[PDB]
């Protein structure tokens, strides 16, 4: 559910990133494990994670 919520959230981020904003640092709250962030990165086409 979270990954679905995040991908959708980022789709709206990249659309608002098209004289407002260019690069976005989306903060993922997945505890002390990089799983959430890593998964989210792959599915959103993030530059750096």
């Amino acid at each position: 559910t979270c990954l679905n919520t995040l991908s959708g959230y980022c789709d709206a981020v990249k659309q608002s990133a098209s004289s407002r904003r260019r690069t976005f640092v989306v903060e993922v709250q997945g505890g002390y494990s990089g799983y959430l962030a890593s998964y989210a990165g792959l599915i959103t086409g993030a530059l750096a994670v």
């Binding site: 789709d11 004289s19 407002r20 904003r21």
Partner: protein, 884 residues
Amino acid sequence: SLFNGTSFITLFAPNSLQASIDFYTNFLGFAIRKNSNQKLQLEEDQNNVSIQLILDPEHAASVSQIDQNIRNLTIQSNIAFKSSSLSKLVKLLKDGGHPVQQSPNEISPFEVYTVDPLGSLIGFGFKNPFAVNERVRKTIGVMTSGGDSPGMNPFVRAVVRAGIYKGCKVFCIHEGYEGLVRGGEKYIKETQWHDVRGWLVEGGTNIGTARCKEFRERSGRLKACKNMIDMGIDALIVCGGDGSLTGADRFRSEWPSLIEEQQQFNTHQNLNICGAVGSIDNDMSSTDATIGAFSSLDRICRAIDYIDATASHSRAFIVEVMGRHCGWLGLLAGLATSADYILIPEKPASSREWQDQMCDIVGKHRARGKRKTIVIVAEGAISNDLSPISCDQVKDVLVNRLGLDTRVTTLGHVQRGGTAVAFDRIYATLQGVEAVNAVLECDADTPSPMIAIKEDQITRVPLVDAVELTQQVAKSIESRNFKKAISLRDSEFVEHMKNFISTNSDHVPPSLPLEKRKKIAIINVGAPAGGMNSAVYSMATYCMSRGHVPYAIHNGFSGLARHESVRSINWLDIEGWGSLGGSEIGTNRTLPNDADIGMIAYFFEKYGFDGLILVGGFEAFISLHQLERARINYPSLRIPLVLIPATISNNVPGTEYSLGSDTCLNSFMEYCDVIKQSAAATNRVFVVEVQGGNSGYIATHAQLACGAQISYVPEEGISLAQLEMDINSLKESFANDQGKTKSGRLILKSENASKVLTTEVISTIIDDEASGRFDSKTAIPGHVQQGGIPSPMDRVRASRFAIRAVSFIERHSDRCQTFKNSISFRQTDEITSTAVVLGIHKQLRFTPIRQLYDFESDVPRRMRNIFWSNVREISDMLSGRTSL
């Protein structure tokens, strides 16, 4: 020195003297000195102001009269006075029939004329900021009728709370008329404030609806009447459909059922009844939008959007739409999703068979390049001869007459389910509030009201007249006068019908003669907003419909001046633009003067634009004014300039509705729901940072739609005293949650409300003060609130406005070409009227940029007087907020 001071001004009168004596005393505050030697005007004590008046024939009546009229041209020796707050005197003179001259009309020196002309007034000796300005009780019954309509719960929540606040018992009549006829504690339950907790999010009707067979007869209507008098219900509020309200109207006229079988008959003598339309159909005639209509429209468009989100030849798609009597849902879905052909009851095929009509329109679209054909079939889809047209009927024509593989999508109950859209939540809530007030304000001589919306404004309309009018429309359809039926529907319906067929029709010869065809350009200025692309799509397709040449100025004023970004608009290239988010053209915050104004003017003449449409926020607002003021230098700019406000903020003066604010409101409303749901799962508050800048519009509306306890707005700010009061409110709120529904708590804080007391700071103060009784967490979504796919409302409103903009340019172009082809342009009133802002006011009106810039805006760094003050009051009422 030798000219040590100024003693007095000496004035000579002809022979008569009194006219001036009355002027300087009433207008300037002077007084005649006691015991006059012949037949001195001093101001006041502890001063040195004096004007001497003599009746000696030293000044002629003929000369003075000629000089007064000579001054009526907007030079002579004069006298100036030191006077504080000149603004007040200027108004007093102007309204008193005296002309005045001033610096920025804000203002520095004021100058008027008497029989003694040129009487100046300065607000100081030399240039500097000026001299400081001196010195009633009745128990209510709510019920819902007809099919499920999103927004019925928000309405009931509103009625329960409003009525409670106004000090009266609220009863919820379960199962509508069935519950009213059966009566008893079983169906008529007393409802408390905490019983309607979090109903904003809830879909359908928690009270319930039921079709009562008995109430259709006098048998039941009497039983229902008894039950109200037994329950002590002094007033009824019905929230339902057409017949649902017609039956309430019949019950109103049949109320004198005194039936001997007197204490109760004396008290419960009159029926206080109020109606609100709870329908997805939007069939009721005296309202612009019924409760549930936009949520239903949203469900339909959500499906169409998914259908469009794919590849392919020989494909047709049918969207079977719910809505038995009206074609509003079909027409608006068709408009919002640019459907090829719509089958609605108000516009059946007339000059040719519906199959021939459909195939021609569909065919033309496919031939020009459009591969995804979408056909919308209304529940009330009908032919000339009133024969209902089914989906299968439509499917076989597409499969057999054309070679298309047709896949039908039917919404069914989807169109009644889900939470109410922001518009339905905001409007159903306000309607609930109004329904209570109407019911309380009611007197036996006042005709029973129905709550209605008329161009984004809540009004009261007689229920009888609304019931009669809806029947008149049904009569027109049944009597086969569809053209008449269309005109009988609200003015928005007739405009949308016109808008749709024109935008649907490039592939037919132009509607204007060669001479009347123009070159219209469009730009996007500011941050992106939902409907920017729709305004462009609608304007281009409408231009093609008329025979105009639509031009798109890519990437604002910077793109034009530095790069010659004038680009043509091709119908096939703009396919699906009405449904796309952001700005395809490209938008920026660059102003015409921050880009080359001379270069903008050069390209305007190079491409010979006959008009300009600006779609954007406050920067596009300033842009209009900058282009208007440059008209003196450049004849190329002496053409109609129209602004269609597009900001998520709603900071642009001229409109009460900016494009993209509903898209934004709905995305934030969906975000806040999840946050409140999360708070409901754990004794916790959320401080939710809101966008919109210096405009508090979005946080105001999000507070109402989400049920936030507080909303901190930039216009009010955040005081420590209010913060302490509000924190103590939270402390008490959680101490009283023992027993009630756990719906969760929100505080909405517009980033601009406080630079010091920030979302994060506020939340840490809540934790500090909470003393472990509850916690606070922030929710900072960011400048993502824009949203992708624009709301059906935004897509629809943008279409309407883009067309009104083109139509204004059509009207004013002839007048402009007089100023365009001529030098010696002195910047008259006929020309300033052409640089305008399209807007909603109570009425859809074009307002000249001059009056809104000079008088209606914080032109400066603030970029923003609010209208939403009442919405604020109601949302504080509904959440129990105590201000200071």
